[PDB]
């Protein structure tokens, strides 16, 4: 447990980007954002296999680049946006 990996940027990961954007738009500090895409590198920490995971993402939204931190409850499939900041310099 506790392993950090660099993971794919496929549909699971792109959907983490949409979640982050959808969650932040309900807050509104960053305006009304349009999800564009998630870019490499996407990092994932295994807090405990099949139970807890954490993600660090670079996400493009309304043509600006942001960094988001997302937790995931593997059993409920529920997610929480812990952090959304930017614009950030590219990786």
Swiss-Prot record:
> Which keywords are on file for this protein?
Taste-modifying protein
Under the heading Pfam families, the entry gives:
Monellin (PF09200)
Q: Where is this site: Blocking, abolishes the sweet taste?
A: 42
Q: Which residues form the signal peptide?
A: none
Q: How is it used?
A: Natural monellin has not been mass marketed to the food industry, primarily due to the challenge of large-scale purification of the protein which is relatively sensitive to heat or acid treatment.
Query: Which SUPFAM superfamilies does the protein's record reference?
Result: Cystatin/monellin
Q: So which domain of life are we looking at? A: Eukaryota
Q: InterPro entries, per this entry?
A: Cystatin_sf (IPR046350), Monellin (IPR015283), Monellin_B (IPR002095), Sweet-Taste_Mod_sf (IPR053768)
* TM regions (residue ranges): none
Its job: Taste-modifying protein; intensely sweet-tasting protein.
How it assembles, according to the record, is: Heterodimer of an A chain and a B chain.
This chain belongs to the protein called Monellin chain B
Q: Which organism is it from?
A: Dioscoreophyllum cumminsii
């Amino acid at each position: 447990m506790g392993e950090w990996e660099i993971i794919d940027i496929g549909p699971f990961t792109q959907n983490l980007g949409k979640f982050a954007v959808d969650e932040e738009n309900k807050i509104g500090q960053y305006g009304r954002l349009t999800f564009n895409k998630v870019i490499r590198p996407c990092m994932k920490k295994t807090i405990y296999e099949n139970k807890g995971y954490e993600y660090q993402l670079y996400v493009y939204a309304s043509d600006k680049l942001f960094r988001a931190d997302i937790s995931e409850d593997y059993k409920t499939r529920g997610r929480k946006l812990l952090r959304f900041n930017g614009p950030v310099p590219p990786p």
